[PDB]
Design a protein around this nucleic acid. Structure first.
Lengths: 72, 129, 95, 95, 76, 224, 195
RNA sequence: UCUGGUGCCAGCAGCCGCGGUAAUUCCAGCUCCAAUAGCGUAUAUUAAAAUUGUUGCAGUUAAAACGCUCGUAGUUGAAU
RNA sequence: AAGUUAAGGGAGUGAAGACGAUCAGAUACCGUCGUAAUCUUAACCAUAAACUAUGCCGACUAGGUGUUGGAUGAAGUGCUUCCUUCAGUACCUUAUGAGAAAUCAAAGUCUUUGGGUUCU
RNA sequence: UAUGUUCGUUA
């Protein structure tokens, strides 16, 4: 028994053998604009990547997290 | 001819949810579909939906949460007594622990569980889970 | 007539070891092939050497597909050492 | 089982297409299905060009061309090698 | 996001909120100074009030109008 | 046992830095080696066994110019009877090597099966929490939750596969050509593997994304 | 800031080819009167500074691989890999190295960087078998199957590719502590450029 | 894949099949299996059969979209 | 389409037929001729692989290349092209859609089975 | 782009 992780874009939970779903990690920066060993994570399901919309979904998620502010 | 407005609404909801588009436009709104949508909302399956109430039997835009496996109408609206609620449930709903069969009853639109707890089964509208 | 991949790969495996010992002379390049190799058949002992000579006559004329030795570094170091209207408007629109 | 998506012809939004007759055998074939070759040829070969253009007058006379515009049934076109059988995947390529 | 869509004007007729592309306008012929109302996508011939002059030829769309005149939208 | 360390997930499990199989299922890493069960479900110092059995053998021939060229295709099923099941097929000239290869492929096809309680959290789950369907070729199979006292009311292959999955209570209903045992088995396996991908209302709550094994032990693969 | 902006203008990233595509309307701004599209460069900048921002998050950089199947992308990817800690393969991609665990090379990464999705779609295909996210320099017509961070740029211009990889390396260096942000750089783009 | 006999005969066999000299299938012996004071056979009928399908079939190519359109009965019918 | 009835027409082609060939035979394929028919009018017949072998109406789901007919907006030279849009009509790619597969943007939205309806 | 038929039954 385990609780499978859930796509942050489509909120569908990723099965055990997808192998197409990915986990992106984005690092933030200090004042000087330098990495700190702490990061944050996004998870994208396989079918979004296969359809090719993963880029737009990542843009939207990172805008919600204010990691980049061009929206779309 | 569309025959059933609710059938169109639910098929559109299901298709948009399968694509995972997170927001969907249903053009021919109606009071029945509004009550169905807000019952889905109350059960937590959709987010904030909003009716664009123009002068032409207006439209509806609903926010999806990736939270619905299948929403569908049942046509015709078979009249179901309180006794055969279980018989319909065990055939339609995917488990007897979650999922709702929506009934139109003399007391308004309601799911099977609360129609049972309030007596007075009615006519079947649809289901979602 | 062609030549077999066994002799081709046996010709490729050598050269890379003592290119500083291989030289221009055909007879010398023949002799060193048995001097360094382990083949038991003399027909090979000269047949592979023929192809080895055929390979070194391809050097000092172009790439020869292989041999990463002391002679591929000097070359590397020596080789190392208003605008379109829409895009001008882009510059002006951004800042 | 439906060898070709278009059924071996180019009929759409249409019910009936008037047939033509094969230039080789004379068989009736729907015009949209026939293999049509517009054939623009010299009257004579290049040697006879060379000979006529010297035995002629006007010292610049240009040999007229021949416009034939043949149309063939499928059997005649295949036999005359105007079209090949082609593999299953290449069957979809038209240019 | 379909609620706050803003470029629905370029969209086809009967967009999110259906809205006619036609309008009404007033016409001032220079040297004539006439006041009368005209319908965009007018369907039949129309005449002036002060001095009768052809104004717009009815076509399948927004008419051909005249080579001159100052025509102003009647929108409020 | 005594493998020469080459890959990275194999190296990471062989040392023991990964303590269960749930995290690899969580991050959906492929399993490329039978090591990841050799050093995982050992006969000794282990909670439960893995039962290997040969569901079917299919003679299958190619009909070359000289003769027939018949090779044998082995279907085997693997499972701990506790939520882990796997199906493996391998075709080889000889039955013995076919069996071995099928066992290997069943082992690395191992999947978690969401057994679903229907009466009580205190009681162990006994059935699928779901009407789950699986299809392969013509055959389609339905697993329907059943009350606790039932058996598996299904075909012999459905029983054999669901026992390995650890489900002990289910109604089965099939359509299509179930006579093709390979497609039957694959359909049952598909239905079982779809259990953990249904998104029941319980799993609506969002959970934090835990570090992948690769990123969490990256330095451990850096000294070599 | 101002000088860092000034050092990338002269190149030809802004031009992007025809075949308007569909999923790059956000990145394209207007197609030229001659029919050649132009990229924003107001989105390419942050796409780069975010792709590098996720590259640095990889603890050991050698766990990232960069691919380019073109000659003029070769020197770029090799030089980017040499300068940063990640590693690159250029030229022909043998189609087994991400799924075939037996072959002599293998060596699967944790992160994939792609010069051109259309040209080396094989690597992008293989990533979805082993959970590799993939960043890609996506030209105006590039396909976006199995790509997550698409850097909108030019993929056919030698100088464009060389600059893109050069300042990607520059950003992944800024992002660590190797050298500060303030000082101007010394390494010139021709040091990256195809010969 | 026990022993005799017969040897495309006699025979068995619901179906696939067995039987021309090594018959695991006939005729026997021994052994074993199954149900058991019960066990076969024939016909009918139910499930199996989602192969009559309301639930719940199929109709491009396996059987199967009327040549096409109009049209009455019937069935169905926007929002308020 | 063929066929039937009655007038007309009757060139070319040509079920029948007659020859000439080919062949073991050849009543066939090939050739020469040739009746009905083919064409017109007025009546019948009601059938075709009458085929996209895919009933009709409605909704939803995706990109690109075209093209036919309107409409809107914009520009090289009153002229000519581009953009948007509606209605046709095809084609290519894609399917964590379907299917037994061939394949299919419908043959999808079907064991997560029900929009309406007719026929088989 | 002349002609060129047939192969008993079973296993």
């Amino acid at each position: 028994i385990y609780i499978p992780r859930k796509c942050s874009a489509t909120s569908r939970l990723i099965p055990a053998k997808e192998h197409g779903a990915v986990q992106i990690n984005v690092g933030m920066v200090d004042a000087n604009g330098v990495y700190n060993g702490k990061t944050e994570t996004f998870a994208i399901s396989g079918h979004v990547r296969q359809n090719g919309e993963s880029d737009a979904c990542l843009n939207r998620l990172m805008y919600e997290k204010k990691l980049l502010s061009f929206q779309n | 001819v569309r025959m059933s407005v609710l059938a169109d609404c639910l098929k559109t909801i299901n298709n948009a949810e399968k694509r995972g588009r997170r927001q969907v436009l249903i053009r021919p709104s109606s009071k029945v579909v509004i009550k169905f949508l807000q019952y889905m909302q109350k059960k937590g399956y959709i987010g904030s939906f909003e009716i664009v109430d123009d002068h032409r039997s207006g439209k509806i835009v609903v926010n999806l949460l990736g939270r619905i496996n299948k929403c569908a109408v049942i046509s015709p609206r078979y009249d179901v007594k309180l006794d055969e609620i279980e018989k319909i449930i065990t055939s339609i709903l995917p488990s007897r622990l979650f999922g709702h069969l929506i009934l139109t009853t003399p007391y308004g639109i309601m799911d099977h569980e609360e129609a049972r707890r309030k007596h007075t089964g009615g006519k079947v509208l649809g289901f979602f889970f | 007539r062609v030549r077999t991949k066994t002799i081709k790969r046996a010709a490729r495996q050598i050269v890379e070891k003592y290119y500083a010992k291989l030289t221009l002379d055909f007879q010398i390049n023949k002799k060193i092939t048995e001097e360094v190799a382990i083949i038991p058949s003399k027909r090979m002992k000269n047949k592979v050497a023929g192809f080895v000579t055929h390979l070194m006559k391809r050097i000092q004329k172009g790439p020869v597909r292989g041999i990463s030795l002391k002679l591929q570094e000097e070359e590397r170091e020596r080789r190392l050492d208003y605008v379109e209207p829409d895009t001008l408007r882009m510059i002006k629109s951004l800042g | 089982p439906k060898k070709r998506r278009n059924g071996g012809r180019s009929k759409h939004n249409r019910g009936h297409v008037n047939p033509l007759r094969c230039s080789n055998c004379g068989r009736c074939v729907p015009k949209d299905k026939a293999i049509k070759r517009f054939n623009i040829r010299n009257i004579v070969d290049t040697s006879a060009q060379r000979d006529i253009k010297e035995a002629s007058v006007y010292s610049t006379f240009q040999l007229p061309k021949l416009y034939i515009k043949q149309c063939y049934c499928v059997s005649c076109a295949i036999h005359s090698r105007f079209v090949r059988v082609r593999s299953r995947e290449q069957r979809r390529v038209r240019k | 996001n379909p609620d706050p869509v803003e470029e629905s004007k370029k969209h086809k007729l009967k967009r999110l909120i259906p809205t006619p592309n036609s309008y009404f306008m007033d016409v001032k012929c220079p040297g004539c100074l006439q006041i009368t109302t005209l319908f965009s996508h007018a369907q039949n011939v129309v005449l002036c009030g002060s001095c009768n002059i052809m104004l717009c030829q009815p076509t399948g769309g927004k008419c051909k109008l005249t080579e001159g005149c100052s025509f102003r939208k009647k929108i409020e | 046992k005594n493998w020469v360390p080459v890959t990275k997930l194999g190296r990471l499990v062989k040392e023991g830095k990964i303590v269960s199989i749930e995290e690899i299922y969580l991050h959906s890493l492929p399993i490329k080696e039978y090591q990841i069960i050799d050093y995982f479900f050992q006969p000794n110092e282990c909670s439960h066994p893995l039962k290997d059995d040969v569901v079917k053998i299919m003679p299958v021939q190619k009909q070359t110019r000289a003769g027939q060229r018949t090779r044998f295709k082995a279907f085997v099923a693997i499972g701990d009877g506790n939520g882990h099941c796997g199906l493996g097929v391998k075709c080889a000239k000889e039955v013995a090597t076919a069996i071995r290869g099928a066992i290997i492929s069943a082992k690395l096809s191992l999947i978690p099966v969401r057994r679903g309680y229907w009466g009580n959290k205190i009681g162990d789950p006994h059935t699928v929490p779901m009407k789950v369907s699986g299809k392969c070729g013509s055959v389609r199979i339905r697993l329907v939750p059943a009350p606790r006292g039932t058996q598996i009311v299904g075909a012999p292959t459905t029983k054999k596969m669901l026992n390995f999955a650890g489900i002990k209570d289910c109604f089965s209903s099939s359509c299509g050509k179930t006579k093709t045992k390979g497609n039957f088995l694959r359909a049952i396996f598909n239905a079982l593997s779809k259990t953990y991908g249904y998104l029941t209302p319980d799993l609506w709550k969002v959970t934090n994304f835990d570090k992948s094994p690769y990123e969490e032990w990256s330095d451990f693969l850096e000294t070599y | 800031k101002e000088e860092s902006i000034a050092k990338m203008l002269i190149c030809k990233v802004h031009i992007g080819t025809k075949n308007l595509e569909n999923k790059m309307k956000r990145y394209v701004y207007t197609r030229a009167k001659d029919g050649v599209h132009i990229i924003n460069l107001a989105k390419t900048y942050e796409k780069l500074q975010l792709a590098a921002r996720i590259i640095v998050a990889i603890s050991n950089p050698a766990d990232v691989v960069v691919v380019s199947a073109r000659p003029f992308g070769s020197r770029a990817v090799l030089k980017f890999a040499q300068y940063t800690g990640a590693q690159a393969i250029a030229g022909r991609w043998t189609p087994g190295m991400l799924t075939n665990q037996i072959i002599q090379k293998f060596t699967e990464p944790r992160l994939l960087i792609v010069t051109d999705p259309r040209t080396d779609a094989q690597s992008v295909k293989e990533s979805a078998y082993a959970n590799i996210p993939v960043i890609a320099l996506c030209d105006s017509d590039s396909p976006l199957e199995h790509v997550d961070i698409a850097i909108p740029c030019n993929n056919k211009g030698k100088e464009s590719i060389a600059l893109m990889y050069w300042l990607l390396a520059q950003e992944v260096l800024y992002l660590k502590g190797v050298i500060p942000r303030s000082e101007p750089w010394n390494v010139m783009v021709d040091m990256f450029l195809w010969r």
